[model samples]
Target chain A: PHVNVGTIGHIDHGKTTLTAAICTVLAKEGKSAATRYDQIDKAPEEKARGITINSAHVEYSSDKRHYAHVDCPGHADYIKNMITGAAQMDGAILVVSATDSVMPQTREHILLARQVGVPRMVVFLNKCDIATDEEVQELVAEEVRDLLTSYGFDGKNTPIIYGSALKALEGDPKWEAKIHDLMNAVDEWIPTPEREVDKPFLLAIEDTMTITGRGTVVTGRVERGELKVGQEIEIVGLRPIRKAVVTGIEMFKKELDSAMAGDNAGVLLRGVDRKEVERGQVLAKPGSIKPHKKFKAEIYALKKEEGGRHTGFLNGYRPQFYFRTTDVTGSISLPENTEMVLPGDNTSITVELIAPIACEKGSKFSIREGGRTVGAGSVTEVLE
Target chain B: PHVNVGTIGHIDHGKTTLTAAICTVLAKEGKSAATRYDQIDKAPEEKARGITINSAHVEYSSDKRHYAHVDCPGHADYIKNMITGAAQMDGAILVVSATDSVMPQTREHILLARQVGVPRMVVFLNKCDIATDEEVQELVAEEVRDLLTSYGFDGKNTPIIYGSALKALEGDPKWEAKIHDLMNAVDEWIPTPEREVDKPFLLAIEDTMTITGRGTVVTGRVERGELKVGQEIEIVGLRPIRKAVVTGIEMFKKELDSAMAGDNAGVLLRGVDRKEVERGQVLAKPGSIKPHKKFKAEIYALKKEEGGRHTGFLNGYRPQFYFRTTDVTGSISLPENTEMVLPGDNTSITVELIAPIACEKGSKFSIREGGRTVGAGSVTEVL
Candidate 1:
């Protein structure tokens, strides 16, 4: 299983350098391919000069597990990504420059990450090479521990690796070893989260096309479960909803015998026509799931402070309900006793889709309106 | 010299992985102390599950120059960061996963980067190992080039590195070489930005402290130029503006003979009292800068759409003008021809400070009202 982790720290504190070093060090050791500094970062500190904003996406593994590394630029950016579903962090690596120790934004970064549900964290006291005095590095480390503890993280036990990313980038052996030490800390401290891969096979068709000799091909990241070549599948949410055989499976254009949860792949259908399969449709194991037009959900409407609705919505309000890769206009019917769904309120409501789409209990989605995500919820029970 | 570069790509496209790989490989090569995968990233894709928002800040040196790597999560975050002065991208690395060549946000990301003034970009077609078919990778490359050309970037000249960041992270030798290939391209393609380090020495005191035996210490990132021990400096913007000699310099707790632009350091002054020198004060080489009470500037007020003021303000309206590390209420006087400084307007105005400040032409600051940044401008002349 893989864990999603993020790097959080004040700007110029070496979060990106630490991330880059992780990939580079592992690459040198023959574990993963190294991506360059430029490859991971597209933008940094030109706010005074008026240059507009910027991730470095990199993944690596230790002897025990694999990790998808997400780099967060700032508190605002991190919060926004969370609402948009573009990023998630199960754990965090807080980067603090040894020179500046706990500068401004350090607490904000940690608090935001904590509020966002980052349960575990490890600290990297970076730029130690420049801040080189041993006593001072320890001082900074102590400062970081105090700060982390105040924020409710396990400061005393959370591993703090003292190193300089710049030195490691230049191939300093000792600093590189420090990088290893940090990685080992992460490997031990952050636990691997169990995923929901045991459910029946399901995939959302984000794209579909037809090959000259092949049948219709639907592509999407596997939402959950797994699929093998020649498995029976059902296409729903569009006419004529029918069952078909998964003739083949391919990922990244490489023909694979099977594809599982989290794999972005294209599945070849035996008889479905190009016109029959479309984006926004779900491909699932036959008899595992079905299309529904209504369901009961528990949703939380965001407050104005969270960049959401400024006011409550009454019954019969229509908004775009975004499922995995598709959205459908839906009318929300508030529970009888509930006169309205106020901002920041968590309430139960019945939703009737303008068009039927395959969804099930526990399927998660967001409610968007006026160019922003105003609310989100999960299906508690399918009504039809 | 250093270049500020950012990573732009769809989420899960290997931008972060590539960044981690760069740091890792360089660390192994003895250049940068490696930060781990989790060190650079603090949040990613739980939008469906409702996890709240998300850099990995990493810096590396090529044979030619040092680079500060900034990771941007998405378009909105990037634009917001630019406005707030937290992040900037001189150039960008467009990370496209080979499996999904150009996703939905690809164009939006490129356009935002371009509009934000990123003049150049390099492409890293990552995930080649998973998308291992060489022909398909080339096809994805062609598609990316087309996308780049559409956005006015030089598709033909821009170097596109094909590699797998995940493979590199797992210690794949070939992929590590690929990471080097991308770094070499960056070293040659992204030019070192010429900076303003030659300008007169200016440091904004962000903090100040008194030590029992050390006298007064003012701490801040060097704004420009250089400073050394024993250099005569002037403190301005507070009562009894005075001159003092730098007795010592320290950075990251290590004694340093000198500090230059961009280095965060602490300077011990010969005699200034800690009570007299405070945050929001300016320290500079004597006579290089002075406190000013008024100045003429070219200002741009943000529109309501940009989360700024809903309407313009008339002459004599007092708003806070935030200069480096300081904010002071200043009255804005509109030019005679202008009726008012309307939202989204770019106009000329004279600002009179409530208190005199050491300012000069070309100094930049933002105007704040209602707890939001409503406008920003630069001094055209000290009035």
Candidate 2:
């Protein structure tokens, strides 16, 4: 069984730093850090400007199990990327700063974790070395507890470890115990999902592209079902076209004749062009997934004052549309002849998309405005 | 010039409640609210769920200025939607709860404001009426102050408003002063960009789809130049097919002859499927924009252990990719043959994409690990 562990925190709160730390410490002979060194070679210009523009993955093993650490970007501008990446994780390590207490990005990261439904999380209060004052450290912890409580987290129950990632990775004796404790907690709390290879096939497309000579390749984690090379599959929501035969299958680097759900795999199809299908479009067995161009969803306005003129129409406003792995652009239109929606007022509204898409009924999605992720709700109905 | 303001905060933090209060007060003539209530006809399911799934825009006037309040979703799942909406704002009102202090979403909201380059922000601490004690309020203020400090904000100088949007909207005497203070800060601190009509015509495509009768309709905020009906323009970086002409243009509900930069308008092109053009794909002069297949970026690993790998090569881990408005799935492959990267290491490396797309050099983006956002950097080179 494969365990996926992700790192979460505000921009520059040391999520990636902690990820590197874990990999280094867990490596055989403590040489993993040395071996994995040049995996991420950012250019000098990125160094000069300061920001991580993409997510990277690394594999590590503890005495008990092998782990995959996902390093998420902390800045709000790249939130769309975070949402896409968070869809695959089973658990997350929320990193906070000991000196900074709880910041905005920290909260955002937590909320995203909850939104993505990551079953378990651990809070790592890093940067303790620079904080110096014990009182400051205590205050940071208290604030973190309070922030967690407000978000429905039980402070006493949630495990929070305080230590600097920088120091712990340096082999500090004091930090090692905390690191072990965290690892143990992860082992105890986050269990790898039971692999079910016999379920019906379902895969969320992560990317769709074409190779110069290899035709079209679609890569994503198999949610369910067994995919065999040369099997016929239907592209559920590709308007004007659906249904394609799987020409080949590749898992990791090797071409496999058959693959199962829960594993990330790439599928090469015989007749689809990269342009014929876009990301967020789904593929499924015929008749299993229905396409909807209009739907009813529960929506909360970040602020009441902004509900468009009551004609009950969502007009001139464009927000990010996140449904599963596909992040697309869409609009919300209220039923005709409605006046106004008060903030905090939960209301059912019909959302008309610019195009047709498929989503399981009752699947919830969150809404954001001006970089602030505000609310979430479920899909109640899909219009014909 | 039109002014856009967005409200951001955590769930049940009164983001929606505050918006309703503000709208109730501003739309007192009952016209704005009534129009939305009667015309827009919010769906029954939304009323039941109580959480916003998408953004809503409403127009209102305060004193001497006309404002477009853009209410965003405050949950983490919809953050991408929020960022896209907020990217066009001139200023933002960050709402925090007095009883709760600065929560996680508060920090994310502030970071987003900074990332989008919003010129100014005003912090409003709501729920003061519910605070249990003076110490509670003080702790909240201190927390907000501490959060601002890390982000390089000066609490002493930044305007912090303490009030309940509920009471303030109801005409509370003391709270009105705070509202006025917020209004004054917005007026003084936020500078509306002078519309530049002469520059190259560019539209940050926010939404695009194929209308039944119309081939492809793209909506965006015009960055510069004039867009007119019957004008020929090229959609830069639209793979396989590169250029096209503007067969039609629609501003709001009317078919306009032309529109200048800063105007939110929709364009209809004669040829192009939805796949040919993407959300982040830029529409520009035929030869000005190029699609890059491989790019180089400077990345900072927040964890200390990630940097010790090979000096030039970092592991090709699965990281989130955000550029312009497009969220592409890709991995970062450090120079081959490099070993361990330590935590807190700032390294420059070349990135190979799993899918080829368009990108410009020096473009800023971010990476996230687990749920916490780890760091941000820029694209230094694009192939």
Candidate 3:
């Protein structure tokens, strides 16, 4: 499996070039095939004739780990993908030009990485060939470290590698050495994110289909933990919890004895009626979860840049809360006596779900309105 | 009375500073009042704790003309406002930091200006105090001019003024003179956009109300031209053209003798019954426009940056067409034998409106799906 890594930097900072370089450097070991810069940057509409900046992804691997590298076109694509769970970056490489040092968008790039929940970051101080002065490189590195600290990162401990992506692309020995060093730093510095399988077993129902001569089959991605054939489970999130037995588990039409977290599968449940199990209900190990009507969360309302609401919402504002595969209406109130929640606001809020849904502390969910994800948050404390 | 002027540049290129300086320079002569940079830049939420960048607007005037200066935080605000007509830039001032010269975002800034229908622009080369090397200054200017020419602007003739806004804001005398030169360039170089009054008269019916005693009245902004009491107009876009005379005109509860383009007014028809007039119909001078079921347009589907559809739509895709105040479903087909229209694609397409609505050549409309504007274009030909 590959670790999902993303590159964030200002325009013309050589992010794409560095990605191409990474692929070339690794291709020598037959770990990954080399890709060209032109092949990486997708075409823009000829008529808009605007900047051809758009998101393009690449793949490479170090000796230790495979890497899936993603490029953000700008703030819009990055924020939208993060909220919708369409694309995710487990770790990120912060590319800054040593020649330009800190550009205007540097702060935004770091803030976005923080907002999108990029767990950790490594710094790639690119374009060092043009910045020949040793003093300038160190100064740039210091500035970057300071900027990272201000944004709540371990600036001092975070690895910083100074290299020239242009020279690396040209197969220069000195610059290519820097690329190898960066790969090693990434392998050692960024920790792998904890797998969901390590948590309690839970599966929020996405769809329930009735099978002829068999019981109802509830299909959904396993949110956490695992389930096996003949295991006892509880269908919760409603007034009365319904007990069921996992008769069978099937993924992509292949019958399996069991399934773990992050696996999309359908489980044929015995002793549950077709109407008893529905979307918005969660299937979990007996007594693992219970429906809660209220919870406290630290919410971040998406900014206009994130394709969200432009204006702020006041207390008691109601929005649809999307937890796992289902949704429920929730009335939100600022927990810390705040008056309004503006776009780009990250504040504590207490939500009263119109109907209780199965969730526990640390459960993540998105807040949507009018077909747009206006905000998102994680459950901090659940109150019955 | 004031022209809408927007300041577009890469972040931290002195757009906000230049706007404050303009207000300060004008306040000395009682032409305008000075505003602070803090007052101009709105507060960002404390928690995002990120860079504070948002769209802000200010007003000022030189002795010659009053100007409304708008600042774009980024591309999102600019594109959305332009499409929705919530805000528009009739003209623009291009701000560039002399230290950096043409930045990576420089091309995007010019492209957005062109996309939003900004008629003309004047360049302000800010931070010139540090760029005292005359050769370096000219190099930056030449680079900027070349970039503008590539984007289809008249770069050779476009005026570029050198000034330091930070110095002018601190009341530096020599730099303040440069600010004056920039102001003159803006007034003399950028042409005033043609007023809507210069076009033929048309009004898209937004809402129709029928009072117990009074006949039906239609309220909408005058899209173009003017209308006066007793003037003959036709409510078209449906079956038969129902002709009527403007018996009364009212705007904001006050009776008006005449209303021109850009005025939101309600006109009472003398002959047509309350049931005859409806929204989506147009009230225009006789023969000025006609109902059209088909037309061709050069459309630009919004990119993900514009809060539009992310995927491409194949030919024969039917989306709601929003023209003026109303919307109608229209089937789109590529004109040049194309297969699909991708987001950010600017291509020619032919459309067949499910129902006819009054429109003429040069009419603009937005293509929408699921409550989002997926694309926008103007009528290229009335076919």
Candidate 4:
């Protein structure tokens, strides 16, 4: 497993800076390319404002493990990128600015995690060096602690590592040691995922590269079971259905005879058009899956602190949906006898899809509307 | 990671008998009571009717390796039990009775394994004692080889073991050597699961135990990452996927909070189960897993050999579908139009399952009819 860890929280809480700082520390520990925040905040306006503009994945490795860290944007419009990779996350790093109390989006992010079922999390009280008053920082930590307690987190021992990520990146000697502490904390607290190796091989195509001589190479995580070279498999649930023997499998740049669940690998699948087998299609044992269009879900109507504008989910609410690698548009409606839903309703609704995507039952998802998350939802029913 | 090997094949291929033989052999080698043939079958009807009516789990070990093996039913109706435990297997032993050749149920079982993605597999050509004609045996063996090839199995290299499990169980000493040979084959073919212990922690609650002293002890395999005592965790995606601190954790009775992935530990979850916190729920980083309701998909109509009677799936084609441990219903149809889908049509369609179940993106599912899978599906969209 690449150990996907998502960074989420309020808009100005150093989610980007902390993401950069963590990588920078790992880079110093010897893995190069982890400290490129310059490339991370690529857009001109975002670079000018010193805020993360898009969600970007960077690789980092300590002697203990490797990680595929996501600097998920705090801004709403760019969150669809976060949603796209959200399901891949085994856990999260909620970067809370030490000077500020928990914000509205902070609450929304927690609810999002609740809906997604992200089980383990750690709080990084970032920007500790920038805060003017020690009293203010301490009070904020107390407030943040109470907030985490309200969310059922262990306030006393949730591994709250305090430091200024911006400071650590800028070579602030005072915060340098704390940054290393954060790394150690992550190693101890973050639990590795136990992928279902017993199930069928299901790989979610993340990035695909076409080589002139080697043909098309697909990089993805084996969600369950395993795939070996010379083993026959099919890229099912899409057009020009492909059946091919595994020509090759590679992990960490080294060729493997086989790759099992939780492994991030690139595969050489022979005989499918590169375009047909793009990032969203899946590879599995054929005859195991069929695609469906409409299904029922239980959605969390995310409560907003900006203004109490959301009454509940309206009967005819439509929102853009995110599951795995696909972004979709859908209409969510309750079954008969129900009229409307309120914020934090946690109610079941049926989403009629705009495009077809492949997923398993009890799948997790996040719904976004008008650049903000409406909340998260799960497939409760697949209806006729 | 203890490798899990299971048996699945057509009806009466002695799936249970073979499972028991392997288990009994391991038990005699000084494993525990977890490998008892009588316990593996467990029902009077299965003994009297000569057909496995249910599925059961047992543990076994060879000098080769240890396993959590399942005697998955080859029958259609009871297959759900098999699906529930199927994802936990690393590879499989596909039982093909020599006398019967490959039956319809055998095909169904193979398709089931395909849907669940059981990668490495071996074939046990069972009931060879009665199939006395060596030529017929060779013919059936060749035919079975072709059938496996049709299913994309390694036709030339797939290790096929021949012996009658019943004969071996009934004190026939000749078949004993074949049993250990099968064990060794399993060790070489079925690679143990390499758990992603560096990811976020995930646990699917299987069985719950209430200690006389300790409040609530939930038994489950660590799906990913690790969990430690005093660690703050949550059971996500349900009423709560509730957040709680790790009060205690034990593996095989030894206390450990830093329980890594692939560890089956009994956790003392502080918050008791109520509402949505129960079996089938995945425990992970809180707020990391959100549940969804509706989704879209693409289906393989499984060409049924081009002319076989699977007449394109109708617009109203609704069949019970399986994913993970949940069984739900839904209707299949085209986006806006199109009445039916043919066997060769690998088309996009909408299936509305009867209820919302917890799943992630790119989840694999199978659609079943008369206990046989008509086709298979993947979650194309979480609508």
- Candidate 2 deviant stretches above 4 angstroms: A28-31, A35-52, A72-74, A130-156, A194-200, A203-223, A227-291, A294-351, A354-356, A361-384, B1-383
- Model 3 residue B273 CA deviation (Å) reads 7.9
In candidate 1, position B295 carries an lDDT of 92
The sequence of per-residue lDDT tens digits that candidate 3 reaches over residues A59-81 is 88888998888775555444434
Candidate 1 TM-score to native: 0.33
Residue B367 of model 1, lDDT score:
88
Q: Which 10 residues in a row give candidate 2 chain A its minimum summed lDDT?
A: A43-52
Per-residue CA lDDT of model 4 for B1-383, tens digit only, reads 57877787777888888877776655565763424456656644333321123557777777856788777553642344333333356888888888767665665556455444566788888988988777766766775666555555665677788888887665466886778888888888777776588767778677767776777777788777888888777765334345777788888778875788788888887766444356656667766555555666655554444221234444677777765444567787664323345443444567776655556545667767665656556665676
Candidate 4 TM-score to native: 0.33
Deviation from native of the Cα of residue A147 in model 4, angstroms:
4.0
Best by TM-score: 3
Q: Is the docking of candidate 1 incorrect, acceptable, medium or high quality?
A: incorrect
lDDT of 1: 0.76
Cα lDDT tens digits, model 2, B1-383, are 66878777766676655665666555555523622322222423233221123566666666656677776553642344333332367777778888655655676566555544565667778888787476777666766665655555565566677778767666676665666667666666666655668665777677987888769888887766777777667675436536788877798698888878778888887777877776766666556556665777655544322212111112666656665555555677654212223233344556665565556654566655543445445566677
DockQ of each: 0.01, 0.01, 0.01, 0.01
Per-candidate TM-scores read 0.33, 0.36, 0.45, 0.33
| lDDT (tens digit, per residue) of candidate 2 on A14-126 | 77667766766666355244423235322111110112135566776666777776664435322433333333567778888876566556765565555445666778888
- lDDT (tens digit, per residue) of candidate 4 on A1-384: 557686777887887778788778767758647556676665322221111234567788766778887664435523333332333567778888866556556655664554455666788888777675778676667655655655555667777777888888887767877777876777778787765786778888888777666567788888788888888887754344567667889888888899888899998877645786776667887755544458776555554442212434445677887665666788877743234454434456788777665655556566777656667666645663
The runs of at least 3 residues in candidate 3 whose Cα sits more than 4 Å from the true structure, single-residue gaps closed, are: A1-384, B27-42, B45-53, B99-105, B146-153, B192-199, B207-225, B234-257, B260-277, B286-316, B332-352, B359-383
Q: Global lDDT of each model?
A: 0.76, 0.61, 0.77, 0.65
Between the candidate structures 3 and 4, which one is better when assessed by TM-score? 3
